[PDB]
Amino acid sequence: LVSGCNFVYVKPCRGGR
């Protein structure tokens, strides 16, 4: 992710995060 998925739950990241 280019966005910080650890801080903000990004849509393509939401599967794991």
Distances (CA, A) of 17 to 2, 3: 14, 13
Q: Residue 9 carries which side chain, given as an amino acid letter?
A: Y
Task: Provide the token pair at 9.
Answer: 């739950």
Task: Report the alpha-carbon distance of residue 2 to residue 16 in Å, rounded.
Answer: 16
Angle at 10 between CA 15 and CA 2, to 5 degrees: 115
Alpha-carbon gap, residue 17 to 13, rounded angstroms: 6
